[PDB]
Design a protein around this ligand. Sequence first.
Ligand SMILES: [Mg+2]
Ligand SMILES: [Mg+2]
Ligand SMILES: [Mg+2]
Ligand SMILES: [Mg+2]
Ligand SMILES: [Mg+2]
Ligand SMILES: [Mg+2]
Ligand SMILES: [Mg+2]
Ligand SMILES: [Mg+2]
Ligand SMILES: [Mg+2]
Ligand SMILES: [Mg+2]
Ligand SMILES: [Mg+2]
Ligand SMILES: [Mg+2]
Ligand SMILES: [Mg+2]
Ligand SMILES: [Mg+2]
Ligand SMILES: [Mg+2]
Ligand SMILES: [Mg+2]
Ligand SMILES: [Mg+2]
Ligand SMILES: [Mg+2]
Ligand SMILES: [Mg+2]
Ligand SMILES: [Mg+2]
Ligand SMILES: [Mg+2]
Ligand SMILES: [Mg+2]
Ligand SMILES: [Mg+2]
Ligand SMILES: [Mg+2]
Ligand SMILES: [Mg+2]
Ligand SMILES: [Mg+2]
Ligand SMILES: [Mg+2]
Ligand SMILES: [Mg+2]
Ligand SMILES: [Mg+2]
Ligand SMILES: [Mg+2]
Ligand SMILES: [Zn+2]
Lengths: 60, 153, 15, 394, 57
Amino acid sequence: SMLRLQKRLASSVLRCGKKKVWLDPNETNEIANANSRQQIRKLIKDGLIIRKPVTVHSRA
Amino acid sequence: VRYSLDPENPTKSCKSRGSNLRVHFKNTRETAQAIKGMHIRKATKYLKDVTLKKQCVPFRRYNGGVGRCAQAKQWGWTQGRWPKKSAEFLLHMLKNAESNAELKGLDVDSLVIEHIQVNKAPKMRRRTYRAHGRINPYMSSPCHIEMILTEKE
Amino acid sequence: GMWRFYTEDSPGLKV
Amino acid sequence: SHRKFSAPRHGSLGFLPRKRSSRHRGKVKSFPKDDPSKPVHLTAFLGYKAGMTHIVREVDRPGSKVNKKEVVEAVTIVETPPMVVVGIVGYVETPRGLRTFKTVFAEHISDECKRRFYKNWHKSKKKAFTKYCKKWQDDAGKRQLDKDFSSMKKYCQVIRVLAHTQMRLLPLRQKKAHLMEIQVNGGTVAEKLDWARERLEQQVPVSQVFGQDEMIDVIGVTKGKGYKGVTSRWHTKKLPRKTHRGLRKVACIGAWHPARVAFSVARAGQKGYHHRTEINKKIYKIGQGYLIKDGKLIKNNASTDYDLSDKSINPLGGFVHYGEVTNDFVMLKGCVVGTKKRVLTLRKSLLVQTKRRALEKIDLKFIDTTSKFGHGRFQTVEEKKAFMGPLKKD
Amino acid sequence: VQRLTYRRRLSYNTASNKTRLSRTPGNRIVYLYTKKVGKAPKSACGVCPGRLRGVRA
RNA sequence: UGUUCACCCACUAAUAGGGAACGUGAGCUGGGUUUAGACCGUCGUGAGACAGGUUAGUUUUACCCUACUGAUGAUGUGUUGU
RNA sequence: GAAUGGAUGAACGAGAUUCCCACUGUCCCUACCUACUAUCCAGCGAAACCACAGCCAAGGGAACGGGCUUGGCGGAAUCAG
RNA sequence: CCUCUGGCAUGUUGGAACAAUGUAGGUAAGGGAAGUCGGCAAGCCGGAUCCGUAACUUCGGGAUAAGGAUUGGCUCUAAGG
RNA sequence: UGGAGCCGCCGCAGGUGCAGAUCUUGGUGGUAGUAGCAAAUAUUCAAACGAGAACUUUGAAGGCCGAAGUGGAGAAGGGUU
Ligand SMILES: [Mg+2]
Ligand SMILES: [Mg+2]
Ligand SMILES: [Mg+2]
Ligand SMILES: [Mg+2]
Ligand SMILES: [Mg+2]
Ligand SMILES: [Mg+2]
Ligand SMILES: [Mg+2]
Ligand SMILES: [Mg+2]
Ligand SMILES: [Mg+2]
Ligand SMILES: [Mg+2]
Ligand SMILES: [Mg+2]
Ligand SMILES: [Mg+2]
Ligand SMILES: [Mg+2]
Ligand SMILES: [Mg+2]
Ligand SMILES: [Mg+2]
Ligand SMILES: [Mg+2]
Ligand SMILES: [Mg+2]
Ligand SMILES: [Mg+2]
Ligand SMILES: [Mg+2]
Ligand SMILES: [Mg+2]
Ligand SMILES: [Mg+2]
Ligand SMILES: [Mg+2]
Ligand SMILES: [Mg+2]
Ligand SMILES: [Mg+2]
Ligand SMILES: [Mg+2]
Ligand SMILES: [Mg+2]
Ligand SMILES: [Mg+2]
Ligand SMILES: [Mg+2]
Ligand SMILES: [Mg+2]
Ligand SMILES: [Mg+2]
Ligand SMILES: [Zn+2]
């Protein structure tokens, strides 16, 4: 429905951008009733919200 | 309330109006003239064509700058447009008239849109900022619409 | 009202 | 004050309302005067601009620096399959003008032709001339026809034949054949009318109408170029770089005091798709179409007495934005009006032609057939195959 | 690269607002504000230009 | 040469003369006149002046009517096409 | 015309001129291409200006008329310019 | 000029066309300032290395004066701690 | 139509009669569905929510800002944004 709050918090929990936050688009409803962080920290451990890897910039 | 032009036989004539609607008076006016005197089941069809640009609404009076279109030849006119909001609003009005005819107990598919009338409604206003620190109006011109169907078949 | 002309433009100048 | 430095004016006033031509097929505005003495003939034909190419020829104007020298010369091909006469039509002289008096149509008329009478054919039931053709098979109708011709024989002066193209035979997209009135010029009206009556429902090829090395006048609509500014449409001066409100304009429309802009001032509008009547286009070569006796005779087109190959006037990869000229064609010197595929009215000259250039007999020595669709370098495919040899697609 | 911010409301780089980098246990570079450099006392005699020995500057 | 005007070169068949709000700035340009800055000369006690010279100096608006250019259309002919 | 400074003068100048070399669509003489507009549509939506208005020729007239006189004439509604 | 970290949704809208005028970019045969008040505008020039550098001069400059040549990729060699 | 006061005659009294004042205050037209919503490259596909999606959100792709940032923090000013 609307996951701008979740994406903000997620990023503050991860200590990444929110470029890097990934929310599973299948399991949206679960994410939408996450409101607090530590609800979000639970979701991170389950693998619904994830930190994406860095965009590779080779030096080679 | 009192409508302008009360019907000939109220027994078998349904009514509707919509006051103070945010719809361009001029556009609405013209699409109401096009629709006037149709059979209701034609009229709904026509307005839906106007929504999809399969039939136009000729702009006869308020026609300044309005473009020409092939679709207007039907009407015997060169100007024409596809005012989508105006259709959308007096599709709802028809819907409500059809509702009322059904409530009154009239043959819905005998109803000819006998009388329809778009009147100017009191203007809204918001402002537009212009060159050299002037502030002009940028006003909406909304309308009241009102209409009368009648069993004729 | 509209700006129109500058103060030292003085449109229809006929000295 | 007077204009300082004189210059002649831009564009002609003898060509204006520079507007979009109401017709598409160019009208023969005036057919030649029938001297009732020489034998009957059609005056005009109706062709299609297929394209352009070179020619080469020895030239025979004594005195010139180009006498007995080979020159090259641009030509238009005009694919002109034979015309079917479907009607005749009598005109009567009046002080008002030249009233049309009686139109007799033929019995059978092709769908090529019928097409023209409807704006939509797909939709129509194709009922045109249905009740008309009934007339040709009964006593009352056949008697009514015979009286109508006899009335035309009595009262009419000018007789034009209604002919139409054989759209069937062209590579074009359209099937809707062009009709056209063509003036019969020749002997007495009766003799003229009997000839047309004989030609009804019959083909009329080009070579009947025109001969070779004949000056003709091409009549057609110009290649249309939309709305165009005054600098394109009238070739006025461009104003210099600095001009604040644009420079592809005319600066002074008009003086103050005839306080109206004149019709003689240059304004922007429709450029092209005008009706135009060019004159003195010499037919270099009337060509024969493809035909069969056992196999194809493709040679008879672009082969000459000095080349003797097996070419067609079709260049490699066809004429561009057109097709294969399979039918009989004329070959005019120079350009002609209009775009490719454009229907084109040819008309015998309005003019007694007795100039040294207008009586020159043309023997072509070489017709170029190299591709136009890019810089072509081989005349024919068989020549290319020899030069290149085998390719990987073998 | 980890860019960083001042830790106080004093934005302007001043004599007061001198800093240094420090990596923490948390594995982040952070600013610590530095104390000013103290000077050893000069001699009363007023001719010997060097500053005194055996005194914490 | 800001010039109109003028003169000279060159070509030409000829390099005739004029008008249109000294045609034509919501067509341009702004070189010149003709604001404000400044320089020189002459004049003025002076502020300042100079059909005396010099240099630097904002060129607005059209979507209204008409006109013209092109573009759809209009009344008539029963309708429609040719 | 002489510190109301005269005469000079390297270096410097978004200062004022003149010529030459190079270079060029400045021009002969214009053409084509691209983007954003203008264009048409949906939605939204101002202003200035406005005696009435809005086809001309000539006349006379406050001595250059849309209106008056005498002639020419006049055909809905509009679009881009 | 291109990229990662981080950040945005093209700056108060969209769609369909690709006319004239424009605004902003380009390119032009042959000529080369004939254009114009006036080379305005644009174009030439441009980096580095190696040569080479006039008048005049306050002897500092002028000076990147002017005018030339070279420049890529690859495989080696030599020289510097 | 409206729903609570008003007039004739004789006298008296006046802040007593509007077309104008580039009049004052308020309202409404034509212009006009017109000018316009063109600075800074850019969007596309799917799903979700939802009465309703060109614009919200999630995912995927393509792009830009390109550490003198369209990033991360403050000062003044704002004052709950
Ligand atoms: Mg504004
Ligand atoms: Mg302001
Ligand atoms: Mg003259
Ligand atoms: Mg300018
Ligand atoms: Mg070609
Ligand atoms: Mg302090
Ligand atoms: Mg004048
Ligand atoms: Mg003017
Ligand atoms: Mg001007
Ligand atoms: Mg000046
Ligand atoms: Mg001055
Ligand atoms: Mg417009
Ligand atoms: Mg003196
Ligand atoms: Mg002096
Ligand atoms: Mg007037
Ligand atoms: Mg953009
Ligand atoms: Mg956007
Ligand atoms: Mg913004
Ligand atoms: Mg060139
Ligand atoms: Mg000149
Ligand atoms: Mg010159
Ligand atoms: Mg320059
Ligand atoms: Mg020098
Ligand atoms: Mg009461
Ligand atoms: Mg009182
Ligand atoms: Mg009043
Ligand atoms: Mg618009
Ligand atoms: Mg960039
Ligand atoms: Mg922040
Ligand atoms: Mg910031
Ligand atoms: Zn001491």
